[PDB]
Amino acid sequence: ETTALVCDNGSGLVKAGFAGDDAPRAVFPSIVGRPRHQGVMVGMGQKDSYVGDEAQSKRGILTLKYPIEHGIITNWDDMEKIWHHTFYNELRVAPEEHPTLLTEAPLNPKANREKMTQIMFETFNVPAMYVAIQAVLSLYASGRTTGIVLDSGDGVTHNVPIYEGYALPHAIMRLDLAGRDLTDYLMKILTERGYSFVTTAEREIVRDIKEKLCYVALDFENEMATAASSSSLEKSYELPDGQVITIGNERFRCPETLFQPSFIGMESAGIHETTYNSIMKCDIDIRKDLYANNVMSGGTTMYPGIADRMQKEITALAPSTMKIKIIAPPERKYSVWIGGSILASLSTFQQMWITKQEYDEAGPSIVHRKCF
Amino acid sequence: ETTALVCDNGSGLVKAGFAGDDAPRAVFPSIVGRPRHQGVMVGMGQKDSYVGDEAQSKRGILTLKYPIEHGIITNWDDMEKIWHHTFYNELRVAPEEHPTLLTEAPLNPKANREKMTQIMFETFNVPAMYVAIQAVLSLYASGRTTGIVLDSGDGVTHNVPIYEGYALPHAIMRLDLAGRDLTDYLMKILTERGYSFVTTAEREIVRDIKEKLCYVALDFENEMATAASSSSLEKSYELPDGQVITIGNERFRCPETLFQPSFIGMESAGIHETTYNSIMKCDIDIRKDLYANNVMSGGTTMYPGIADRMQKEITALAPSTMKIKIIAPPERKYSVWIGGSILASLSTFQQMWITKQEYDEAGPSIVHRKCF
Amino acid sequence: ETTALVCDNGSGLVKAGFAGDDAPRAVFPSIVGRPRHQGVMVGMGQKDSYVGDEAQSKRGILTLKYPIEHGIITNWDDMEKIWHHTFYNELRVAPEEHPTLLTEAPLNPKANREKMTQIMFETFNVPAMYVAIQAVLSLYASGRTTGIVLDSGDGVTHNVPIYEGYALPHAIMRLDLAGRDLTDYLMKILTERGYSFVTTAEREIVRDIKEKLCYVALDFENEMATAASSSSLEKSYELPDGQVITIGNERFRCPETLFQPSFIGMESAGIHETTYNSIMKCDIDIRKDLYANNVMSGGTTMYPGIADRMQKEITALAPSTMKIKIIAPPERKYSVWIGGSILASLSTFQQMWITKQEYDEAGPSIVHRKCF
């Protein structure tokens, strides 16, 4: 058989591969670079624009644009370059051969799916397509049918409660805190220690400081006192040029804004209170199964100690006879792709695809008809 | 009462005087000169180093250092000489008598305030001190409680939105375009016409060509065509020695880099797009009041036509039902000092001072506790 | 094909030849001599003025003018004589046959290219022309696409950073220390030992003492102590008339002013600190590649030990995890010509030439339009 593609556009990373594989063939940043300086040498083989690992490699010459932000595609001519690179250069497969599966954050604009569909059939000429809610796929990955899923990548965070494969749309919470807003906060706070980062090519440095050094405090105000009193907590990092920077009590302050969006001036409650309020909107027969199956998903949940901090601060809210368990598998950065990889391999699914014969009759609005 | 001192270190200029005055007693460049040649005469009354109007007068013999750049104090032994000159020679007042108020650009390194505080209490022995955000003072000066303030001196530019005296820290933009980088650009571009300027003592000439001759085009590419086609725009200036230089289409190209930082190889957007993006980070109930109260502040906003160019190019971005007003008072070069002069005179403020009795208990870190 | 001429006017030397050759056909000093005495014999075949190797041969009778100083052409009626000699006498080729390529120091006056172009099309009637930045050609010569280039001839020194064939114009440093100011310093310092040299015809002697005897100390103050204490360092030279002079600790003092322009009363920093500051103006992602590819170019970099002195005194500034390499090929005096020889042979280049049909339409200002 022709296996289908699974392509988790996400934001910030593209994850792609064939259904039935256990990890993606292609993981590269969803970033398009254009050169800003004057090219002076002649015969250099100048190239209009760079995608992914190239734009990361040459980033010092480039201006880097993400075409997707908050799970919304904001520039289609970039995004189509990213798909073109994914199919032809990175997977080295012609998409006209076999179906494609795409993933989207819930509750985002209706036109985004119509444009994705129109591009997939018109330019890439895919034989059939489907789009699937990421947080649903995270359950397929973690091997469950009853869950509440905190799925948090770059761009967007959302909670979806699912009971025995019935989703509860009225209870779906979406929040726009994400790895990119922890990064922009880490930029505005590192400045306290004099370090400075003003360009995209070094926003990509701060993005990797955040990944290695940052961690989540099990209780915030005592570690704030500790690392204000003893320097033993602070750690140091070599910038690309060889300068050494040092980061102390800061390296737990940026991921803790997930629990206090007030630090960046948002009104809304952190991931713990939005998780609890999402459970509270569910009807009371299912709350015990939701409290047991809290599933972490996506990369922004990778910070050390976010599991124990969640279990603590939800147990501070839950009724004390209940039992609260946070399921944080180590693969979890890929779980949306793994779930889509198994979903697309199910023989039952093969009916679900939007085929081109349907699209040519109904137009791109068919998605709202046949998808979720 | 003992009136407090107001000392707006800024960069490039020092502005100082007593609270409740309407203009500063002391305006002199924040520049320290040391002699580089061999002194040959004997009995001359040689002097180690010169501050301010002296280093300006003798500049042909000296090397001129600015101790502050990009609003960061980089040499404390110079800076303390500048403060010493300010209190004892220029104001002719012992700072041990009465409090002092100091101004700083937002979002700059945390240690700069601690060092300023430590020097003010330890060496100058001031009874009480405070440090105040410049852009807040520009509103006190312009008589407003709701504003967005483009404050741009030597060293640094920043936007701060303020609504009814609540600042919105998440929306504070800081930019390192400034009068000094327009000056270094004017040096690298005047070379096109053969004139050359390689030393600090003539960097101080270029800094005054920029002040008199330069102006901002209401639309760039038509004046570029005009002054490429008609010489009628060009104007001439006498150097100190009596050589005449002539400057044409150049004299609008250097201040226009405020709107196209690409000319000096920065990524970031000009002052107009950073102002608009700062408004966009504010919540939508206040944007109409921010759009009405755009306040220009600081000397780098003095170029003829920068008001009309800002109002044009922000109106090009704002929704056309909104109303856009640029408030550019003629005093505006002094508005940060005028605002600090009124702030320090408020009877309500007298509680706010960091007193020495507090500092001796808490140490220099008390600033972060009691200031903003 | 008609091969193009490559004519690296430089200063002090003219280097010329055909594209695709590996060394120039013509290397002669860019010097014009006029006779100053009364000619007494009759029928001698007296000739108004001499160019190049003639003015060197007869120099005792002549006054020698360089028409180019600090990479600026200051006398066009001399310079056009030098070009006339280059094409017709030394290469023995009519320039009307095939294109010509010319080289210029960066950041020099805009009108110099317009005059060069106007003379090349109007008088020499060349079919096509181009002008190329010397420091770019030194990379073509050294076989690299990423570099920072310290190119230092007679007249002018400059640093140009180039990353993968993108130049970084904001980081281009130009400095007016050069072989001619080391020569005038060697004249003013040799007077210490009583020798004296006051005329151009013996400035051309000092220029060759500088070439043979001088060398750069790996550390200045210990060799200054050594050669003040032990005479073992001193070396002797025969003047043309047979007088022997002797030079001791002096012979390293003149080339060391490249690292301490204070010795000749300039403010600015030496070539090492200008190289480092040029790297610092570059963005932080590329600095490791700039630090690895430091390329020496031009004749003033020929002094023995300048490589090791540069590597030392840049390693004193660079972060200690970096690796610093100074690339000083033995040809390097010719590398700008070798680079222009390969550049002009590239088939891709043939579009780049300014053809006469373009010039006749746009006028001499076309250079700024179609060149770099």
Binding site: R193, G194, Y195, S196, Q243 | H70, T74, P109 | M280
Partner: peptide, 7 residues
């Protein structure tokens, strides 16, 4: 500054 720039 201490890193991103010269101050």
């Amino acid at each position: 500054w201490x890193a991103x720039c010269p101050a």
